[PDB]
Subunit: 65 residues, 6 copies
Protein backbone atom coordinates (compact mmCIF):
# COMPACT_ATOMS: atom_id res chain seq x y z
CA UNK A 1 0.00 0.00 0.00
CA UNK A 2 2.79 2.36 0.98
CA UNK A 3 4.73 2.48 -2.31
CA UNK A 4 1.63 3.05 -4.50
CA UNK A 5 0.20 5.67 -2.09
CA UNK A 6 3.37 7.78 -1.91
CA UNK A 7 4.14 7.30 -5.61
CA UNK A 8 0.69 8.72 -6.53
CA UNK A 9 1.19 11.73 -4.24
CA UNK A 10 4.63 12.19 -5.77
CA UNK A 11 3.50 11.75 -9.39
CA UNK A 12 0.56 14.18 -9.01
CA UNK A 13 2.67 16.56 -6.93
CA UNK A 14 -0.20 16.83 -4.40
CA UNK A 15 0.38 19.14 -1.43
CA UNK A 16 0.56 16.94 1.67
CA UNK A 17 0.76 17.12 5.42
CA UNK A 18 3.12 14.73 7.21
CA UNK A 19 2.55 14.50 10.95
CA UNK A 20 5.42 13.39 13.18
CA UNK A 21 5.23 11.25 16.32
CA UNK A 22 5.57 14.40 18.41
CA UNK A 23 2.50 15.96 16.82
CA UNK A 24 4.41 18.39 14.60
CA UNK A 25 3.01 19.00 11.11
CA UNK A 26 5.24 19.27 8.02
CA UNK A 27 3.85 20.44 4.68
CA UNK A 28 5.14 20.24 1.15
CA UNK A 29 5.25 17.83 -1.74
CA UNK A 30 6.78 14.40 -1.84
CA UNK A 31 9.88 14.71 -4.02
CA UNK A 32 11.17 11.17 -3.51
CA UNK A 33 11.30 8.37 -0.96
CA UNK A 34 13.04 5.09 -0.21
CA UNK A 35 12.80 2.31 2.33
CA UNK A 36 13.57 4.60 5.28
CA UNK A 37 13.00 8.26 4.39
CA UNK A 38 10.81 10.69 2.48
CA UNK A 39 12.23 13.80 0.83
CA UNK A 40 9.76 16.61 1.41
CA UNK A 41 10.01 19.79 -0.66
CA UNK A 42 9.08 23.37 0.18
CA UNK A 43 11.67 26.10 0.50
CA UNK A 44 14.36 23.33 0.71
CA UNK A 45 14.29 19.55 0.42
CA UNK A 46 14.17 18.08 3.94
CA UNK A 47 14.75 14.44 4.72
CA UNK A 48 12.09 12.91 6.94
CA UNK A 49 12.70 9.53 8.61
CA UNK A 50 9.61 7.35 8.21
CA UNK A 51 10.16 6.06 11.74
CA UNK A 52 9.33 9.56 13.04
CA UNK A 53 6.20 9.83 10.88
CA UNK A 54 2.72 8.98 12.12
CA UNK A 55 0.56 10.02 9.14
CA UNK A 56 0.66 11.25 5.57
CA UNK A 57 -2.51 13.21 4.73
CA UNK A 58 -3.18 14.34 1.13
CA UNK A 59 -4.48 17.92 0.93
CA UNK A 60 -7.05 16.68 -1.60
CA UNK A 61 -8.53 13.40 -2.82
CA UNK A 62 -6.03 11.30 -4.76
CA UNK A 63 -7.45 8.52 -6.92
CA UNK A 64 -5.78 5.17 -7.66
CA UNK A 65 -3.68 4.07 -4.69
CA UNK B 1 -1.91 -13.92 13.08
CA UNK B 2 -4.51 -12.00 15.10
CA UNK B 3 -3.80 -8.63 13.59
CA UNK B 4 -4.97 -9.44 10.04
CA UNK B 5 -8.34 -11.00 10.89
CA UNK B 6 -9.06 -8.19 13.40
CA UNK B 7 -8.31 -5.45 10.85
CA UNK B 8 -9.95 -7.39 8.01
CA UNK B 9 -13.19 -7.73 10.00
CA UNK B 10 -13.25 -3.97 10.69
CA UNK B 11 -12.56 -3.16 7.05
CA UNK B 12 -15.16 -5.65 5.75
CA UNK B 13 -17.94 -4.49 8.10
CA UNK B 14 -16.91 -0.83 7.62
CA UNK B 15 -16.91 -0.31 11.37
CA UNK B 16 -15.97 3.25 12.41
CA UNK B 17 -12.79 3.02 14.51
CA UNK B 18 -10.56 5.07 16.76
CA UNK B 19 -6.86 4.66 16.15
CA UNK B 20 -4.73 5.98 19.00
CA UNK B 21 -1.25 7.14 18.07
CA UNK B 22 1.77 6.70 20.33
CA UNK B 23 1.51 10.36 21.24
CA UNK B 24 -2.04 10.08 22.53
CA UNK B 25 -3.69 11.62 19.47
CA UNK B 26 -6.89 9.92 18.32
CA UNK B 27 -7.78 9.39 14.67
CA UNK B 28 -11.26 8.30 13.56
CA UNK B 29 -12.57 6.82 10.37
CA UNK B 30 -13.00 3.51 8.62
CA UNK B 31 -10.23 1.13 7.65
CA UNK B 32 -10.01 1.24 3.87
CA UNK B 33 -7.00 -1.04 3.49
CA UNK B 34 -3.75 -2.05 5.23
CA UNK B 35 -0.51 -3.93 4.82
CA UNK B 36 2.25 -4.89 7.24
CA UNK B 37 3.40 -1.29 7.68
CA UNK B 38 0.41 0.97 7.23
CA UNK B 39 -3.33 1.37 7.51
CA UNK B 40 -5.21 3.65 5.14
CA UNK B 41 -7.86 5.44 7.18
CA UNK B 42 -10.74 7.14 5.40
CA UNK B 43 -12.72 10.26 6.23
CA UNK B 44 -12.63 13.35 4.05
CA UNK B 45 -9.48 11.88 2.36
CA UNK B 46 -7.58 8.59 2.66
CA UNK B 47 -4.64 9.15 5.08
CA UNK B 48 -1.79 6.71 5.51
CA UNK B 49 -1.10 5.80 9.10
CA UNK B 50 2.15 3.99 10.00
CA UNK B 51 1.47 1.06 12.30
CA UNK B 52 4.73 1.80 14.18
CA UNK B 53 3.06 5.07 15.30
CA UNK B 54 -0.08 3.26 16.43
CA UNK B 55 -0.69 2.22 20.04
CA UNK B 56 -4.25 0.84 19.79
CA UNK B 57 -7.16 0.27 17.40
CA UNK B 58 -10.54 0.57 19.10
CA UNK B 59 -13.71 -0.50 17.26
CA UNK B 60 -16.62 1.91 17.85
CA UNK B 61 -18.81 -1.18 18.39
CA UNK B 62 -18.43 -4.94 19.00
CA UNK B 63 -17.28 -6.89 15.96
CA UNK B 64 -17.99 -10.63 15.67
CA UNK C 1 10.48 -16.73 26.19
CA UNK C 2 8.90 -15.18 29.26
CA UNK C 3 6.17 -13.32 27.42
CA UNK C 4 4.06 -16.28 26.40
CA UNK C 5 3.71 -17.96 29.78
CA UNK C 6 3.17 -14.59 31.47
CA UNK C 7 0.38 -13.44 29.09
CA UNK C 8 -1.08 -16.96 28.91
CA UNK C 9 -1.37 -17.06 32.73
CA UNK C 10 -3.22 -13.73 32.72
CA UNK C 11 -5.51 -14.78 29.88
CA UNK C 12 -6.21 -18.21 31.35
CA UNK C 13 -7.09 -16.80 34.78
CA UNK C 14 -8.93 -13.84 33.25
CA UNK C 15 -7.04 -11.54 35.59
CA UNK C 16 -7.86 -7.83 35.16
CA UNK C 17 -4.68 -6.01 34.07
CA UNK C 18 -3.34 -2.55 33.39
CA UNK C 19 -1.32 -2.06 30.23
CA UNK C 20 0.72 1.13 30.28
CA UNK C 21 1.53 2.41 26.82
CA UNK C 22 4.76 4.20 25.91
CA UNK C 23 3.07 7.56 26.30
CA UNK C 24 2.33 6.73 29.92
CA UNK C 25 -1.38 6.16 29.34
CA UNK C 26 -2.95 3.21 31.10
CA UNK C 27 -5.42 0.78 29.47
CA UNK C 28 -7.33 -1.78 31.53
CA UNK C 29 -9.22 -4.99 30.94
CA UNK C 30 -8.58 -8.68 30.45
CA UNK C 31 -6.20 -10.28 27.96
CA UNK C 32 -8.42 -12.02 25.39
CA UNK C 33 -5.64 -13.21 23.06
CA UNK C 34 -2.26 -12.13 21.73
CA UNK C 35 0.33 -13.01 19.15
CA UNK C 36 3.86 -11.92 18.48
CA UNK C 37 2.83 -8.34 17.73
CA UNK C 38 -0.44 -7.46 19.47
CA UNK C 39 -2.63 -8.10 22.49
CA UNK C 40 -6.40 -8.05 22.29
CA UNK C 41 -7.62 -6.32 25.42
CA UNK C 42 -11.35 -6.63 26.37
CA UNK C 43 -13.69 -4.21 28.12
CA UNK C 44 -16.68 -2.64 26.40
CA UNK C 45 -15.12 -3.74 23.03
CA UNK C 46 -12.06 -5.78 22.04
CA UNK C 47 -9.26 -3.37 21.27
CA UNK C 48 -6.02 -4.30 19.54
CA UNK C 49 -2.91 -3.11 21.32
CA UNK C 50 0.46 -3.11 19.52
CA UNK C 51 3.19 -4.53 21.74
CA UNK C 52 5.62 -2.03 20.27
CA UNK C 53 3.55 0.67 22.04
CA UNK C 54 3.46 -1.15 25.40
CA UNK C 55 5.85 -0.25 28.24
CA UNK C 56 4.51 -2.62 30.94
CA UNK C 57 1.76 -5.15 31.69
CA UNK C 58 0.61 -5.05 35.31
CA UNK C 59 -1.77 -7.61 36.81
CA UNK C 60 -4.27 -6.26 39.33
CA UNK C 61 -3.40 -9.09 41.69
CA UNK C 62 -0.72 -11.78 42.20
CA UNK C 63 -0.88 -14.56 39.63
CA UNK D 1 28.01 -9.27 26.43
CA UNK D 2 27.09 -6.47 28.88
CA UNK D 3 23.33 -6.35 29.24
CA UNK D 4 23.05 -9.98 30.36
CA UNK D 5 25.83 -10.05 32.96
CA UNK D 6 24.50 -6.72 34.33
CA UNK D 7 20.92 -7.95 34.59
CA UNK D 8 21.97 -11.33 36.03
CA UNK D 9 24.06 -9.83 38.85
CA UNK D 10 21.07 -7.63 39.79
CA UNK D 11 18.69 -10.61 39.78
CA UNK D 12 21.19 -12.91 41.55
CA UNK D 13 21.84 -10.37 44.33
CA UNK D 14 18.19 -9.24 44.47
CA UNK D 15 19.41 -5.64 44.26
CA UNK D 16 16.57 -3.11 44.46
CA UNK D 17 16.48 -1.13 41.19
CA UNK D 18 14.79 1.73 39.43
CA UNK D 19 13.82 1.14 35.84
CA UNK D 20 13.18 4.35 33.95
CA UNK D 21 10.85 4.10 31.00
CA UNK D 22 11.05 6.26 27.88
CA UNK D 23 7.93 8.12 29.03
CA UNK D 24 9.65 9.28 32.23
CA UNK D 25 7.83 6.84 34.49
CA UNK D 26 10.06 5.24 37.11
CA UNK D 27 9.43 1.66 38.21
CA UNK D 28 11.06 0.10 41.26
CA UNK D 29 11.50 -3.41 42.53
CA UNK D 30 13.75 -6.41 42.04
CA UNK D 31 14.48 -8.14 38.75
CA UNK D 32 12.84 -11.56 38.95
CA UNK D 33 13.90 -12.73 35.48
CA UNK D 34 14.44 -11.52 31.92
CA UNK D 35 14.88 -12.76 28.37
CA UNK D 36 15.85 -11.01 25.14
CA UNK D 37 12.70 -8.84 25.11
CA UNK D 38 11.22 -8.27 28.57
CA UNK D 39 12.17 -7.97 32.21
CA UNK D 40 9.93 -9.25 35.01
CA UNK D 41 9.99 -6.71 37.86
CA UNK D 42 8.68 -7.65 41.31
CA UNK D 43 7.03 -5.55 44.00
CA UNK D 44 3.44 -6.08 45.05
CA UNK D 45 2.95 -8.15 41.82
CA UNK D 46 5.25 -9.30 39.04
CA UNK D 47 4.93 -6.88 36.16
CA UNK D 48 6.28 -7.46 32.64
CA UNK D 49 8.36 -4.57 31.32
CA UNK D 50 9.21 -4.36 27.62
CA UNK D 51 12.89 -3.55 27.10
CA UNK D 52 12.01 -1.40 24.06
CA UNK D 53 10.20 0.94 26.50
CA UNK D 54 13.08 1.13 29.02
CA UNK D 55 15.58 3.99 29.02
CA UNK D 56 17.82 3.10 31.94
CA UNK D 57 18.24 0.57 34.75
CA UNK D 58 19.78 2.21 37.81
CA UNK D 59 20.76 -0.07 40.72
CA UNK D 60 20.02 1.36 44.19
CA UNK D 61 23.62 0.50 45.20
CA UNK D 62 26.98 -0.50 43.66
CA UNK D 63 26.85 -4.04 42.29
CA UNK E 1 23.17 5.16 -4.64
CA UNK E 2 20.86 2.54 -3.12
CA UNK E 3 19.03 4.91 -0.84
CA UNK E 4 18.07 8.54 -0.86
CA UNK E 5 19.59 8.90 2.61
CA UNK E 6 23.24 8.19 1.67
CA UNK E 7 23.53 10.56 -1.30
CA UNK E 8 21.58 13.19 0.69
CA UNK E 9 23.77 13.07 3.84
CA UNK E 10 26.90 12.67 1.68
CA UNK E 11 26.01 15.85 -0.24
CA UNK E 12 25.53 17.76 3.00
CA UNK E 13 28.77 16.40 4.46
CA UNK E 14 30.76 17.03 1.26
CA UNK E 15 29.46 20.58 0.83
CA UNK E 16 29.80 21.20 4.58
CA UNK E 17 26.28 22.67 4.47
CA UNK E 18 25.11 23.97 7.84
CA UNK E 19 22.07 21.92 8.84
CA UNK E 20 19.36 21.56 11.42
CA UNK E 21 18.57 18.10 12.74
CA UNK E 22 15.25 17.83 14.60
CA UNK E 23 14.92 15.13 17.23
CA UNK E 24 11.68 13.25 17.96
CA UNK E 25 11.42 15.33 21.23
CA UNK E 26 11.56 18.61 19.46
CA UNK E 27 15.11 19.70 20.23
CA UNK E 28 16.68 21.37 17.21
CA UNK E 29 20.35 20.50 16.67
CA UNK E 30 22.58 22.43 14.28
CA UNK E 31 26.02 22.20 12.81
CA UNK E 32 27.65 20.28 10.01
CA UNK E 33 27.51 16.62 9.21
CA UNK E 34 31.00 15.29 9.92
CA UNK E 35 30.26 11.63 9.22
CA UNK E 36 27.52 9.01 9.44
CA UNK E 37 26.96 5.27 9.38
CA UNK E 38 24.02 2.90 9.35
CA UNK E 39 22.92 3.99 12.82
CA UNK E 40 24.29 7.42 13.76
CA UNK E 41 25.23 10.86 12.49
CA UNK E 42 28.24 12.81 13.82
CA UNK E 43 27.29 16.45 14.05
CA UNK E 44 30.01 19.06 14.56
CA UNK E 45 29.94 22.40 16.34
CA UNK E 46 31.96 23.07 19.47
CA UNK E 47 32.43 19.25 19.80
CA UNK E 48 31.46 16.25 17.70
CA UNK E 49 28.36 14.75 19.07
CA UNK E 50 26.81 11.47 18.10
CA UNK E 51 23.13 11.52 17.16
CA UNK E 52 21.18 8.27 16.83
CA UNK E 53 19.15 8.20 13.61
CA UNK E 54 16.32 6.47 15.47
CA UNK E 55 15.91 9.66 17.49
CA UNK E 56 15.95 11.91 14.40
CA UNK E 57 12.75 13.18 12.78
CA UNK E 58 14.25 15.39 10.06
CA UNK E 59 17.46 16.76 8.55
CA UNK E 60 16.93 20.21 7.05
CA UNK E 61 19.67 21.88 5.01
CA UNK E 62 20.11 25.57 5.70
CA UNK E 63 20.23 26.10 1.95
CA UNK E 64 19.41 24.30 -1.33
CA UNK E 65 21.78 21.45 -2.17
CA UNK E 66 21.85 20.07 -5.60
CA UNK E 67 22.36 16.47 -6.65
CA UNK F 1 35.25 2.63 8.89
CA UNK F 2 32.06 0.62 8.50
CA UNK F 3 31.05 1.66 12.02
CA UNK F 4 31.30 5.16 13.41
CA UNK F 5 29.51 4.46 16.68
CA UNK F 6 32.09 1.91 17.98
CA UNK F 7 35.25 4.03 17.66
CA UNK F 8 33.44 7.14 18.98
CA UNK F 9 32.18 5.40 22.13
CA UNK F 10 35.52 3.65 22.50
CA UNK F 11 37.45 6.86 22.39
CA UNK F 12 35.20 8.27 25.11
CA UNK F 13 35.64 5.17 27.28
CA UNK F 14 39.39 4.95 26.66
CA UNK F 15 39.97 8.62 27.53
CA UNK F 16 37.36 8.56 30.33
CA UNK F 17 35.80 11.82 29.13
CA UNK F 18 32.75 13.12 31.01
CA UNK F 19 29.77 12.96 28.64
CA UNK F 20 26.12 14.00 28.55
CA UNK F 21 23.68 11.47 27.22
CA UNK F 22 20.39 13.00 26.12
CA UNK F 23 17.45 10.60 26.11
CA UNK F 24 14.48 10.66 23.75
CA UNK F 25 12.28 12.17 26.47
CA UNK F 26 14.61 15.16 26.87
CA UNK F 27 16.14 13.96 30.15
CA UNK F 28 19.93 14.27 30.33
CA UNK F 29 22.32 11.76 31.99
CA UNK F 30 25.99 12.49 32.83
CA UNK F 31 29.04 10.45 33.75
CA UNK F 32 31.72 8.41 32.02
CA UNK F 33 31.27 5.56 29.59
CA UNK F 34 32.51 2.52 31.44
CA UNK F 35 31.56 0.03 28.74
CA UNK F 36 29.04 -0.68 25.98
CA UNK F 37 27.81 -3.36 23.61
CA UNK F 38 25.43 -3.62 20.66
CA UNK F 39 22.37 -2.50 22.64
CA UNK F 40 23.40 -0.74 25.83
CA UNK F 41 25.87 1.72 27.32
CA UNK F 42 27.13 1.50 30.91
CA UNK F 43 27.31 4.99 32.36
CA UNK F 44 29.14 5.61 35.63
CA UNK F 45 28.59 8.17 38.36
CA UNK F 46 27.49 7.20 41.85
CA UNK F 47 26.50 3.75 40.42
CA UNK F 48 26.81 2.07 37.00
CA UNK F 49 23.43 2.54 35.25
CA UNK F 50 22.56 0.66 32.06
CA UNK F 51 21.26 2.87 29.27
CA UNK F 52 19.54 1.37 26.23
CA UNK F 53 20.80 2.96 22.99
CA UNK F 54 17.26 2.87 21.58
CA UNK F 55 16.33 5.39 24.31
CA UNK F 56 19.32 7.67 23.55
CA UNK F 57 19.07 10.68 21.25
CA UNK F 58 22.62 12.08 21.42
CA UNK F 59 25.94 11.53 23.20
CA UNK F 60 27.75 14.84 23.85
CA UNK F 61 31.43 14.76 24.98
CA UNK F 62 32.21 17.53 27.48
CA UNK F 63 35.35 18.36 25.44
CA UNK F 64 36.99 17.67 22.05
CA UNK F 65 38.12 14.05 21.65
CA UNK F 66 40.76 13.45 18.95
Amino acid sequence: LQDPFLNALRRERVPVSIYLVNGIKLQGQIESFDQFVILLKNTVSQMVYKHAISTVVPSRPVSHH
